[PDB]
């Protein structure tokens, strides 16, 4: 690994600098290096890992969607043949995205998840596993579309069962997991009714727990609850 000669603390410090510089590919490489040191990650370090790869894959997903739309229009009735270039370039971006997803999933499997014993770390990483199988599923079309979808569902479900048992309904990671599982249902699994039911039940149970929170935690939880609300407004 190119980061093997750098101190763990230095990699974390540089990941924070790269975030300030909006250098997210660098940020992801630094946090990959930090994970490969083999020690568990703190709450803040898990968040840095997530921000880095979310931004990297975010740019790739946004590009793939632009290109996939051009490719779809190219295959409409009346569209002039332009040769293989659109498909080629869509495939290049798709392959790069898949490689980033594979890299994240490999970090979770070697060996973040297996060493995650606390509910907050285990749920965070299982959510992440669902998320990156979900991004794979957004672009999947062949023999393994169904297995990729089931891998996402399985990871999210294990994370939900732990979160329900071990975390309060307003816990931000529990809320973000439920949010993202509902997006999985709506956008990936062709189950909009499941998506809506999950989002509503999540929102209502969090609402009833807000009275237990400080002003700062209240703000953190309500911010995420607003995303559940926005989705429900779009979905119904």
């Amino acid at each position: 690994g190119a980061m093997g000669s750098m101190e763990r603390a230095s990699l974390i410090q540089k990941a924070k600098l790269a975030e300030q510089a909006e250098r997210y590919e660098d940020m992801a490489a630094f946090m990959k290096g930090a994970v490969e040191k083999g020690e568990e990650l703190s709450c803040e370090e898990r968040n840095l890992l997530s921000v880095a790869y979310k931004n990297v894959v975010g740019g790739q997903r946004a590009a793939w969607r632009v290109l996939s739309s051009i490719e779809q229009k190219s295959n409409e009735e009346g569209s002039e043949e332009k040769g293989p270039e659109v498909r080629e370039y869509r495939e290049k971006v798709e392959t790069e995205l898949q490689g980033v997803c594979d890299t994240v999933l490999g970090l979770l499997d070697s060996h973040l998840i297996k060493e995650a014993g606390d509910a907050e770390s285990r749920v965070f990483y299982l959510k992440m596993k669902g998320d990156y199988y979900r991004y794979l599923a957004e672009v999947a079309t062949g023999d393994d579309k169904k297995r990729i979808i089931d891998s996402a569902r399985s990871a999210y479900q294990e994370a939900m069962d732990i979160s329900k048992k071990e975390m309060p309904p307003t816990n931000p990671i529990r809320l973000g997991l439920a949010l993202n599982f509902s997006v999985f249902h709506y956008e990936i699994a062709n189950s909009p009714e499941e998506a809506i039911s999950l989002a509503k039940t999540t929102f209502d149970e969090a609402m009833a727990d807000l009275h237990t929170l400080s002003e700062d935690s209240y703000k953190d939880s309500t911010l995420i609850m607003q995303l559940l609300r926005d989705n429900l407004t779009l979905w119904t």
């Binding site: 973000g176 956008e187 995420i224």
Partner: peptide, 6 residues
């Protein structure tokens, strides 16, 4: 257009 965890 669905929103996921930020």
């Amino acid at each position: 257009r669905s929103l996921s965890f930020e």
